[PDB]
């Protein structure tokens, strides 16, 4: 816990098979492999801390030491792979899992909902990423709602989703914690665009590969509603 210095940044590509996010976020632009590797290294560091906890047979006895260790770190969770130990970590080690600054949930199994939709606490900041979504099922939206709401601050990144167009306002309207919204090469309707321009508590807005041009009252017309926008 007393080690904050990173140290050697060579190799360490063993953890997190999606080293390049399997063609998702952190793509061609704004790479910086050094920072990508640091993220991998810290993520494996957090996992190691969790593994040491699990084998310490000290579910509550050593909560003070683990609190100091985990505080200020980020944890990455793949929705397609949620190990049993995460459930015990979040359920049995309160005030430590919540001491993490960020949890990254990268996509919708009901298990993902079960882990996040608990009654132990609200998470600080959640970063939700949507990737291979050619269709948005009504059930999927319901499940996302349950996850999105379990936080104080929400960051949402939607990349190359085809099933989202016409349903973006439908999803965004389920949670008011959204303050950072990014859309990458993903189509939308005017109703979805108007909705984005109707959310006044956004701090970050990022639009990529939008080829519509003629967008009445949209993000290309005014966008002066987002007075709190910084980026």
């Amino acid at each position: 816990a007393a080690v904050y210095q990173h140290g050697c940044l060579l190799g360490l590509s063993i953890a997190k098979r999606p080293l390049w996010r399997q063609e998702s976020l952190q793509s061609v632009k704004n790479t910086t492999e050094q920072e990508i590797l640091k993220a991998i290294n810290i993520n494996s560091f957090v996992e190691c801390g969790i593994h040491l906890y699990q084998e310490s047979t000290s579910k509550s006895a050593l909560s003070q030491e683990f609190e100091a260790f985990f505080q200020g770190k980020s944890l990455y969770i793949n929705s397609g792979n949620i190990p049993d130990y995460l459930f015990d970590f979040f359920e049995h080690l309160p005030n430590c899992a919540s001491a993490l600054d960020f949890i990254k949930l990268d996509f919708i199994p009901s298990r993902a909902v079960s882990l996040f939709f608990n009654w132990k606490q609200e998470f600080r900041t959640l970063e939700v990423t949507l990737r291979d979504f050619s269709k948005l099922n009504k059930q999927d939206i319901r499940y996302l709602g349950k996850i999105f709401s379990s936080a104080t601050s929400l960051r949402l990144q939607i990349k190359r989703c085809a099933g989202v167009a016409g349903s973006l306002s439908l999803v965004l309207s389920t949670c008011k914690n959204i303050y950072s919204l990014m859309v990458e090469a993903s189509p939308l309707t005017i109703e979805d665009e108007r909705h984005i321009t109707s959310v006044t508590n956004l701090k970050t807005l990022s639009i990529h590969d939008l080829q519509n041009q003629r967008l009445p009252g949209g993000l290309t017309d005014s966008l002066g509603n987002l007075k709190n926008l910084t980026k």
Binding site: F117, N118, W119, G145, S149, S150, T174
Partner: protein, 257 residues
Amino acid sequence: LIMDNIKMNEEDAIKLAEGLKNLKKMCLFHLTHLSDIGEGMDYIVKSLSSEPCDLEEIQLVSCCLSANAVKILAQNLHNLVKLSILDLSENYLEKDGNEALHELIDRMNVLEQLTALMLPWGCDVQGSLSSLLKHLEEVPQLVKLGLKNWRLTDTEIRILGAFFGKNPLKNFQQLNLAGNRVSSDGWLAFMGVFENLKQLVFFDFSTKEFLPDPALVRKLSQVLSKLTFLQEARLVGWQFDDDDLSVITGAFKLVTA
């Protein structure tokens, strides 16, 4: 004396009202599931509430009470000090009910023993909830309070939120709200009030049909679990799914409809 679902000839009520005059030792009276009577019930309030007695609990439920009967009681609230339980609820006042309520609400300034006040329903008594606040804040022993059988809008919970600020009772246990018209934006507006009501024994906050956001489900389970008692609260009319019922903590009893 308990009279439970007993059929009357619409005349006997008058004769009993007179007979009751000599029962100077009577303390408890229950009148339940009354059939349609109309005239005859006003004779009870005319005969009683006077010629002073030791009545401790007067519980007339669903007794076809008129606004005039309520006005008669209001005039007679100078009597029957020591009375603690006053019901006369589960009853709709067809006309001028609000006026009758206004007169008694501005009284009860001699009734220092009042607990568990239940109110009569009128269309729309809701416009006078602030009139209740006017004197409810003056009674430090309101362990129970019931506001049943009427629509209660988001505006009204904000009014009650002011009531529930509050200069604390530290003895409030029972809250009864049989129905409402509260939106998905809250409700939530008065959550946290429970921090001042840690000894709540039970409540309902029921409705006709409502489907809460996941956020509201989470707030319920993370708040009620901090209560000292929570002795079989109900959530009638709330569309909780199996997933939401899983989230709701191990309450002694749980009713959804």
